[PDB]
């Protein structure tokens, strides 16, 4: 029932993290299809509230069934908080955003992701950097469209000196992985070096 659905979330709104971790990871067992859309926006508001429980919820939301428009809304809500996240939750959030990429969505999501990704903060820092790069290499492995749209983002870049280090490292790795893009990225590099931006 939706009444019990909101009751358990209200109960775990103050419950300790360890037990409420087990509560939210068991939602597919405790799902109610009649109220299945209702609980999702409750979890979206919960994500907007604190982000102290930020990593499990984005993982478990994709497992449940919802409306893709509501998924677009929660993506747009998450994109505000991209800088505020920590190091460990970077790979899971990046995997979440990059997974849900449709045919006509590519350029906008990849451009805002690239312009809002810094990693300048960077112990566990090198390990999480390697994990994030592994996630990027795995996601870029099969899909041409995301790499091509990213190349379009780098080629435009508003022509200003804002060319962060991660942009050119992305250039190198997607040069070294997708062999079908070699000529296009080569010409982009030639033009950008001759332009004087880099």
């Amino acid at each position: 029932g939706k009444d019990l659905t909101t009751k358990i979330m209200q109960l775990i709104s103050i419950a300790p993290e360890n037990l409420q971790h087990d509560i939210i990871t068991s939602l597919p067992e405790i799902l109610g299809d009649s109220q299945h859309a209702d609980v999702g926006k409750e979890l979206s508001d919960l994500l907007i509230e604190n982000t102290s429980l930020t990593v499990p919820i984005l993982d478990v939301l994709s497992s449940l069934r919802l409306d893709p428009n509501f998924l677009l809304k929660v993506r747009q809500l998450v994109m505000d908080k991209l800088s505020s996240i920590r190091l460990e939750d970077l790979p899971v959030i990046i995997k979440f955003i990059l997974h849900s990429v449709t045919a006509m969505d590519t350029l906008e999501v990849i451009s805002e992701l690239r312009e809002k990704l810094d990693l300048q903060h960077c112990s566990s820092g090198q390990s999480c950097i390697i994990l994030l790069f592994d996630v990027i290499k795995s996601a870029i492995r099969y899909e041409k469209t995301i790499s091509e749209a990213w190349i379009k983002a780098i080629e435009n870049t508003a022509s200003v000196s804002e060319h962060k280090v991660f942009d050119l490292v992305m250039l190198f790795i997607i040069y070294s992985t997708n062999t079908q893009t070699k000529k296009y990225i080569d010409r982009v590099l030639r033009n950008k070096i001759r332009s004087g931006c880099i």
């Binding site: 597919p28 299809d33 009649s34 859309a37 994709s62 497992s63 449940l64 069934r65 409306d67 045919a103 492995r141 099969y142 899909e143 041409k144 469209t145 079908q180």
Partner: protein, 316 residues
């Protein structure tokens, strides 16, 4: 690029010359460059390999640049070029050994995508070059495995087409079928939706073509061979369980029900042993709607198959 424009000019010459009598009456035919390269690849058997890389690169370039992008006169060279590319790639697959590990890797890496670009020719080439099933198993039996591990993520059309194309290798093998069975079994239990939508699509193909399927980890453990001859009743129980899973998979969205209803006829036709359980599935599902009485004039329930949630009405 010079080779590509040369072969395009040659096929244009052939298409122009076959299209008239007068021009065909005046000139004698010259060896068009299609058969030239198609003979060079055959001639390359004589123990020189320094042309294989150029040959495969030419094949892939020439296939990509003139693929059918339909998503009329210039189509004929643009189709003969693709046919030549497929012929060249398949020809270099068999003759030379050191290169056959990368050709299949490139074809797979180019065909397993979510981009929904037209990939009919690559699929045809993959089906052609997995005809020689043991040859693939000798050299590159790994790329197919991680292609299988990624099969849960793709949409419904491409997984069905890919599995149908690759099933000739499935027909004559034993390790590959068990790997696919394990992958599909893990995909069924995964709570992520649209994964079951592809798991059932895999299972119908895997079950409607093979009478007997299935077999006969930590570092500290090693697999060993056990020489037990196969037990037919155990395999029949395996099939019965893998079909009972589909029986309880009939509480999903309308597309899974669609493809299940469409595949059960072939499942019944090709595996006669499961005859007395498929019908006990269908007959026990139908009675949820058909309303048996002496007389209740709308004998099928009109509304029992419709759903009302969120005021987005769809049929189930």
């Amino acid at each position: 690029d010079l080779l590509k424009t040369s072969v395009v000019k040659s096929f244009k010459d052939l298409q122009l010359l076959q299209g008239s009598k007068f021009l065909q009456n005046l000139v004698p035919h010259r060896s068009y460059v299609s058969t030239m390269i198609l003979e060079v690849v055959k001639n390359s058997v004589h123990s020189w390999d320094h042309v294989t890389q150029g040959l495969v690169e030419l094949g892939f370039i020439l296939m990509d640049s003139y693929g059918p992008k339909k998503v009329s006169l210039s189509r004929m060279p643009n189709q003969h070029a693709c046919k030549l590319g497929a012929n060249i790639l398949l020809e270099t697959f068999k003759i030379h050994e050191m290169i056959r590990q990368e050709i299949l890797e490139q074809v797979l890496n180019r065909v397993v995508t979510r981009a929904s670009s037209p990939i009919s020719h690559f699929l045809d080439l993959l089906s052609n070059i997995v005809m020689y099933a043991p040859l693939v198993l000798q050299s590159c039996s790994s790329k197919v495995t991680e292609a299988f591990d990624y099969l849960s993520f793709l949409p419904l059309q491409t997984v069905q087409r890919l599995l149908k194309a690759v099933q000739p290798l499935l027909k004559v093998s034993m390790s590959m079928r068990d790997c696919l069975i394990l992958v599909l079994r893990k995909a069924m239990f995964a709570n992520q939706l649209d994964a079951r939508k592809s798991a059932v699509a895999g299972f119908l193909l895997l079950l409607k073509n093979f009478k007997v399927l299935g077999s006969l980890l930590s570092v500290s453990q090693v697999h060993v061979d056990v020489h037990s001859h196969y037990n037919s009743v155990a395999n029949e129980t395996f099939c019965l369980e893998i079909m009972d899973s589909l029986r309880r998979c009939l509480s999903q969205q309308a597309d899974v029900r669609l493809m299940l209803y469409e595949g059960f006829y072939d499942v019944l036709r090709r595996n006669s042993q499961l005859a007395n359980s498929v019908m006990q599935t269908l007959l026990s599902q139908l009675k949820q709607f058909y309303e048996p009485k002496p007389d209740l004039l709308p004998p099928l329930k009109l509304e029992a198959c419709i759903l009302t949630q969120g005021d987005k009405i769809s049929l189930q």
